[PDB]
Design a protein around this ligand. Structure first.
Ligand SMILES: CCCCCCCCCC(=O)CC(=O)N[C@H]1CCOC1=O
Lengths: 82, 166, 94
């Protein structure tokens, strides 16, 4: 039901999380933020996109959802150095 | 020193002491000018937001009447992004922006940055600091080193500033 | 003694370093409290996961690593370091 989904990307791609409360919008927010950083090549720090991005979520549960999606997204392209 | 300023920020009783602490902390961080602006959720009445700081008086007066809030590249950035925006000449593209820039530069607001604010209760705002450095290289290097401390300032300021503006 | 350098000179102690990796690295960062160990825990934590083979559990290393630090201020030092390390190797890879 209140499942959340991190869309597949390049390498190791996907997920099946039962999140404690509804949080798909927060997951997307985290994916988009990370790919917006990967895409637009380093013009600001990656830490900055993570920290300022997380701030914009209201709740600990949302913030944490943001983080999971952000780090997963990085994982995907990081692995992609096959 | 900075940790103490954070606590004083949260302990602040009224707009006056808080805005005083905010300036005293900017000055300690080597930033001679700071502005904090914050609107309630879903408002764009820029000139009637909670606005504090020590921006040059002549300039603030001009900014309000001219309605520069709708020109300022940093202001529209704040409403569309979370990432901080350095004041690179490049953020000023259009004519009215190449012109907003000339005058802002005369007011002393040359080097610096704007951190967007997105409060938990959907509040919107901007935290800007300006630094007087020998050139842009030195300024951007400087601001990247202190950016983590500034992001925490942003955080204590947004949290304590919302329950005083509102 | 430049202005920007003079601000660095006080705050001598509160400065922390994220050593260079591959890409244009050595970040020098001012922190509200001394936090070099938290910084290094975040750097090592991130390398440990990289120096691992067919790798696939990134959030776990981050979540378990941050959780081992007891103050908000260290947690964020660890996050900044760990992520900077994942940046150093995202640009040293085209
Ligand atoms: C999201 C804005 C809502 C609150 C309204 C704030 C209005 C003032 C914003 C401002 O002063 C930002 C600022 O620092 N602009 C800089 C850019 C160049 O010099 C300026 O004055």
């Amino acid at each position: 039901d209140l499942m959340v989904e991190i869309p597949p990307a390049d390498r190791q791609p996907g997920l099946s999380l039962l999140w404690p409360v509804p949080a798909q919008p927060a997951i997307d927010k985290g994916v988009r933020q990370a790919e917006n950083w990967l895409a637009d090549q380093i013009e600001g720090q990656l830490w900055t996109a993570f920290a300022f991005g997380r701030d914009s979520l209201p709740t600990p549960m949302q913030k944490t959802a943001f983080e999971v999606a952000f780090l997963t997204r990085l994982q995907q392209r990081l692995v992609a150095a096959r | 020193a900075l940790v103490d300023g954070f606590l004083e920020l949260e302990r602040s009783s009224g707009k006056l002491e808080w805005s005083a602490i905010l300036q005293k902390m900017a000055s300690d961080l080597g930033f001679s000018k700071i502005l904090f602006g914050l609107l309630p959720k879903d408002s764009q009445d820029y000139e009637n937001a909670f606005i504090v700081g020590n921006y040059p008086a002549a300039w603030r007066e001009h900014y309000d009447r001219a309605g520069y809030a709708r020109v300022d590249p940093t202001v529209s950035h704040c409403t569309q992004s979370v990432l901080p925006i350095f004041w690179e000449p490049s953020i000023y593209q259009t004519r009215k922006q190449h012109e907003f820039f000339e005058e802002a530069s005369a007011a002393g607001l040359v080097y610096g940055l704007t951190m967007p604010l997105h409060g938990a209760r959907g509040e919107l705002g901007a935290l800007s600091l300006s630094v007087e450095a020998e050139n842009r290289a030195e300024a951007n290097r400087f601001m990247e080193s202190v950016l983590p401390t500034l992001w925490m300032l942003k955080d204590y300021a947004l949290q304590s500033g919302a329950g005083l503006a509102f």
